[PDB]
Amino acid sequence: SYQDYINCSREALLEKMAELLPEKRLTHCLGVERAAMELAQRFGVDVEKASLAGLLHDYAKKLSDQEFLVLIDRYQLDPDLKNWGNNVWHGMVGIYKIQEDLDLHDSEILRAIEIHTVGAGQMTDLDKVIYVADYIEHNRAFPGVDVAREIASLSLNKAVAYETARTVEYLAHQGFPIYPQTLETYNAFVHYLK
């Protein structure tokens, strides 16, 4: 059960999360919970760790800038993080909030949530499941989600590669800064597209 990892039940979590997040964000988290489960089954990942990471992944999505900044200092994280924003922080810093609120200490789940947005050059299979589940969960309908879904049905590595290539492409298309760890992911996984 989830109580094996956090300090409350799935139901109590859901109640807590419904306070912290708007409907759409919570529905998305439930989406990722389900998608992570199906991917974990297909690729030999502990389904329960995947489900819980999936549900928790955007837990900290609505922390203010101020709170993230507070968290950066308190946990003495990379000072460069202050030069960034919510996109980077909700996973990379938001893990400290999750740890505070829910007494989550499992290093594998924490890592999966940590790098769900930006990935890393080295990802565990759990990491990859969350990173992909987030992209392909059943409520998303961006153009090309069907291609992501087909790729994720066959290869987790190729799904990571595809998602990261489309993110780098969209960020550059939009003229947004690209967190350098995302490029690390991109360059590690890009060979899989072939």
Ligand X SMILES: Nc1ncnc2c1ncn2[C@@H]1O[C@H](COP(=O)(O)O)[C@@H](O)[C@H]1O
Report the distance separating Cα 24 and Cα 87, nearest Å: 17
Report the distance separating Cα 91 and Cα 113, nearest Å: 6
Binding residues among 114-173 for its own copies as defined by CB under 8 A: 161, 165-166, 168-169, 172-173
Sign of CA dihedral 71, 74, 80, 83: positive
108 in a labelled binding site: no
Binding residues among 123-152 for ligand X as defined by CB under 6 A: 134
Report the distance separating Cα 172 and Cα 170, nearest Å: 5
Report the residue number, 12 or 165, with the smaller CB distance to its own copies: 165
Residue 190 binding its own copies, by CB under 8 A: yes
Secondary structure of residue 106 in the 3-state scheme: coil
Asked if 116 and 57 touch (Cβ cutoff 8 Å), the reply is: yes
CB of 179 to ligand X, least distance (A): 3
Residue 134 binding Fe ion, by CB under 5 A: yes
Q: Which residues bind Fe ion (CB under 5 A)?
A: 58, 117, 134
Binding residues for Fe(3+): 28, 57-58, 90, 116, 134
Binding residues for ADP: 25, 61, 140, 179, 182
